[PDB]
């Protein structure tokens, strides 16, 4: 109903997924072996209003 | 002496209409809701011999099927449809029914429940195998993996049957659910087939689409049409109040 | 005695207040903890039935009895308290905030209807009076 | 009346409330699982039916309000804190410890965070004892909780750690479908039945992490936005009940 | 019985006790 | 006769009289025609009243119809 | 007959 | 012998 609140909902978690993912990045430093990992954020379906 | 009785009918309608704007308000955050329109048709009495006394009937022509806002969960089973698609489930009485919730539950059994009713996919409602991990792909598609055993054993199960419909085509049944209209069954037939070309986005769940705008600007509306109703009816109720007890 | 619609408006007026009454003491009574004796109070209902006099034609509104609700009472995990049970949960009452001001207001619109009838009825009934005179 | 519709409405909000208030005090509960509340509307109310049919499809279809028909909790695995305890073991997916109550009946936890009562026994925070029962001999100078649930113990003197019992983990066929007893444990039901009893790491149950204790799932910016979507439907739905009383104000005071 | 009724009896006193006696 | 309208549902699965799934049936009155029906009847009567003091003068006069 | 007038003494004697 | 009207006589007070 809101709307803009349910896309910067997505925005704030977007953000947490890639704060999350470096945090495990800078975390494993020391580990022999390791492999960088890197989130791709891409975005969602599109809503189309009819244009007479 | 029958004017009162068009101002009743015009604020009874729009009790009837703050009634429709009340429900819709309450399924402000109801998951997959389509809110219901409502409009004001006039009803012109006929007879003779000046036609002056039109009435006033609330009417709720379809609903509203622009999508609303989709909140990210991560959860592979809750999915959310293309602008204009439709999820299908059996309904209640053994019928098939369409909605937007893509809130997909699974129970003990396995099989698939959307409120409770049974997803409908391919051949009939969808089962998947007893306590698997689940996983719904971009074009219905289903996969299943058991918990603990090769990665390499995940296999697709089913289908989803993913419709197309616009408001025309749909009109609300009394349980929530939506069916075809009679004129749109005549053509498009009584089952309506799988569409291929819907896209759907597994681990986002669509809400409901008031808007808070159009509601508050109605309630606005409707309070100040009912004091203009109530007016006219103390104006009447006065005027034949004189005239009877004078003339006599 | 009272004339027939007397009666009857005078019985919604009373069932009105009744409904009012009941709604004010569980407003009161939303955060008692104990009663005089040492149970938590519970939510109480007003029931309205119709007193049809005659066989399914008319009648006013009565009130049989005053019901108390039954709703899980409220658990606030208070150990230290006396009335704590054996897992140390007082019970605070089941009055719900937003109903019980719903119910005020329908109450009070009811009552003022109620009023509006017996006055517009009254101008009539001291008119028909005149027939003989 | 609209006065019963908007005061559903304001219930189910209040729900919603106490349910996210549930969830923000459970924020450093060990293996919590956030809760989320679903809202349905009640049967709708057809007054008269569309005609036969350009125009407007006419038709006068009222609803009646929204209820709360179930809260789902999500079973994601949360993370896992480092507590040097050798007492706390947390798990690697989808299984739960069962648990002996005090009145004779099985529950279900997950929350791993362990002690040892008086006559050895591996028993919960609360006391509850943690089946298939593991006694602990009182040499023991170190413990160690093994990935398939191995209770093995170092004794004085000795070259070889003693084995004592396997934690066998129940793992239900739909985890959403347990019921909530409150404190820290699930009771299962019928829409979570067959408890099938496993050796951790066989048939799908999850591994064991000795010395580390499981976070709850709750996210703390969703639950943000929807207090904030909650309090604005708060107030439209209190905006609509104030409408709904003006206007049979104005009808009585005609 | 029904409240509004005619009674030659007067209506017993109307105590309402803080602590159980 | 009982007025054709249908009976308005209310969701109470908590009061002791309810239905399968909790739906209270209240009574289809709508306030508004009530009113005005009261407000009507009680014009009419009037008038009728109104009616009957005017024919009783008439008579009287008609029974001093000579005299 | 089946209803009685708003004129009415009440019909409960 | 009534008493006091209205505020004092409407509040839970001990008996004396």
Do not use: C
Request: proline fraction near 5%; hydrophobic fraction near 40%.
């Amino acid at each position: 109903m809101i709307s803009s609140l349910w896309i910067a909902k997505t925005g704030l978690d977007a953000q947490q997924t890639n704060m999350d993912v470096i945090a495990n990045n800078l975390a494993n430093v020391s580990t022999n072996g390791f492999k960088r990992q890197r989130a791709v954020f891409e975005d969602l379906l599109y809503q189309t209003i009819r244009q007479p | 002496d029958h004017a009162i009785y068009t101002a009743m009918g015009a604020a009874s309608q729009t009790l009837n209409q703050q009634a429709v704007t009340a429900s819709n308000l309450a399924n402000a955050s109801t998951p997959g809701f389509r809110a219901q329109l409502n409009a004001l048709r006039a009803v012109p009495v006929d007879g003779l011999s000046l036609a002056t006394r039109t009435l006033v009937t609330a009417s709720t022509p379809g609903a509203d099927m622009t999508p609303g806002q989709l909140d990210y969960t991560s959860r592979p089973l809750d999915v959310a449809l293309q602008q204009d698609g439709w999820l299908v489930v059996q309904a209640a009485d053994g019928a098939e029914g369409y909605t937007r919730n893509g809130n997909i539950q699974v129970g003990p059994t396995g099989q698939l429940t959307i409120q409770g009713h049974p997803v409908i996919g391919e051949g009939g409602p969808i089962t998947v195998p007893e306590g698997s991990e689940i996983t719904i792909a971009a074009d219905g598609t289903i996969s299943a993996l058991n918990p603990g055993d090769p990665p390499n054993t995940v296999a697709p199960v089913g289908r989803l049957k993913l419709v197309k419909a616009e408001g025309n085509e749909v009109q609300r049944s009394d349980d929530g659910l939506f069916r075809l209209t009679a004129e749109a069954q005549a053509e498009r037939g009584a089952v309506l087939a799988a569409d291929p070309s819907i896209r759907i986005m597994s681990g986002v769940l669509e809400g409901s689409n008031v808007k808070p705008v159009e509601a508050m600007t109605d309630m606005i509306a409707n309070a100040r049409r009912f004091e203009m109703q109530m007016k006219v009816i103390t104006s009447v109720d006065e005027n034949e109040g004189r005239a009877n007890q004078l003339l006599s | 005695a009272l004339l027939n619609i007397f009666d009857i408006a005078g019985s919604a007026l009373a069932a009105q207040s009744k409904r009012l009454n009941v709604a004010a003491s569980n407003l009161a009574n939303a955060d008692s903890v104990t009663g005089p004796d040492g149970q938590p109070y519970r939510a109480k209902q007003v029931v309205f039935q119709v007193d049809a006099a005659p066989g399914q034609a008319t009648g006013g509104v009565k009130v049989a009895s005053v019901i108390e609700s039954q709703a899980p009472e409220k658990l606030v995990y208070e150990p230290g308290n006396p009335l704590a049970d054996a897992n140390g949960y007082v019970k605070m009452p089941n009055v719900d905030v937003v109903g019980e001001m719903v119910n005020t207001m329908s109450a009070s619109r009811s009552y003022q209807a109620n009023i509006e009838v017996l006055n517009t009825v009254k101008s009539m009934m001291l008119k028909t009076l005149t027939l003989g005179q | 009346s609209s006065l019963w519709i908007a005061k559903t409405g304001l219930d189910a909000q209040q729900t919603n409330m106490d349910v996210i208030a549930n969830n923000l005090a459970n924020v450093s509960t060990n293996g919590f699982k956030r809760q989320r509340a679903v809202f349905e509307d009640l049967l709708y109310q057809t007054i008269r039916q569309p005609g036969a049919q350009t125009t407007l499809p006419s038709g006068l279809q009222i609803g009646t309000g929204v209820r709360p028909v179930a809260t789902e909790r999500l079973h994601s695995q949360g993370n896992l804190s480092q507590t040097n305890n050798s007492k706390d073991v947390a798990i690697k997916g989808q299984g739960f410890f069962q648990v002996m109550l005090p009145d004779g009946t099985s529950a279900y936890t997950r929350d791993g965070s362990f002690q040892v009562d008086q006559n050895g026994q591996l028993v919960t925070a609360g006391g509850f004892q943690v089946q298939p029962a593991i006694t602990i001999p009182a040499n023991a100078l170190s413990i160690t909780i093994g990935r398939d649930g191995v209770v093995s113990v170092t004794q004085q003197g000795q070259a070889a750690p003693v084995q004592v019992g396997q934690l066998n983990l129940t793992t239900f066929m739909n985890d959403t479908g347990l019921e909530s007893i409150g404190e820290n444990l699930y009771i299962e039901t019928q829409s979570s039945g067959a408890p099938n009893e496993s050796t951790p790491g066989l048939n799908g149950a999850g591994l064991l992490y000795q010395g580390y204790v499981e976070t709850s799932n709750v996210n703390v910016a969703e639950e943000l936005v929807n207090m904030i979507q909650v309090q604005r439907a708060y107030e439209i739905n209190s905006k609509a009940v104030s409408t709904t009383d003006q206007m049979l104000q104005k009808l009585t005071q005609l | 019985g029904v409240p509004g009724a005619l009674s030659n009896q007067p209506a017993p006193p109307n105590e309402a006790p803080i602590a159980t006696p």
